[PDB]
């Protein structure tokens, strides 16, 4: 902020708000896959029990 | 619509644009960061000088 004026900072802050959001999006998708795997393993345990 | 008129030095016309910090743009007259519209300037040394 202090190193620039208030007109071209938008392109310089959009990249810092999409990357910080797109990366968070990637992590969530990883959790969904693993959850879909544990769910299949948990049901096997119930059948075994 | 709004029209504002005044006269300044030749080297301080660049200071009129939003964002720039200085004497005329912080003490006398300045524009908001999200300003919409534009400015027009021209030489008048034949008249005022």
Swiss-Prot record, chain A:
The task this protein performs is described as: Subunit of the fusion protein that is processed upon entry into the host cell. Mediates fusion of the virion and cellular membranes by functioning as a class I viral fusion protein. Contains a viral fusion peptide that is unmasked after S2 cleavage. This cleavage can occur at the cell membrane by host TMPRSS2 or during endocytosis by host CSTL. In either case, this triggers an extensive and irreversible conformational change that leads to fusion of the viral envelope with the cellular cytoplasmic membrane, releasing viral genomic RNA into the host cell cytoplasm.
Q: What is this protein called?
A: Spike protein S2'
Q: Which residues of the full protein are shown?
A: 981 to 1029 of 1273
């Amino acid at each position: 902020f202090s190193r620039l004026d208030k007109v071209e900072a938008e392109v310089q802050i959009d990249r810092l708000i999409t990357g910080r959001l797109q990366s968070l999006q990637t992590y969530v998708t990883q959790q969904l896959i693993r959850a879909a795997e544990i769910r299949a393993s948990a049901n096997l345990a119930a059948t075994k029990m | 619509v709004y029209a504002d008129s005044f006269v300044i030095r030749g080297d301080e016309v660049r200071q009129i644009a939003p964002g720039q910090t200085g004497n005329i743009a912080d003490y006398n007259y300045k524009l908001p960061d999200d300003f919409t519209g534009c400015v027009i300037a021209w030489n008048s040394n034949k008249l005022d000088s």
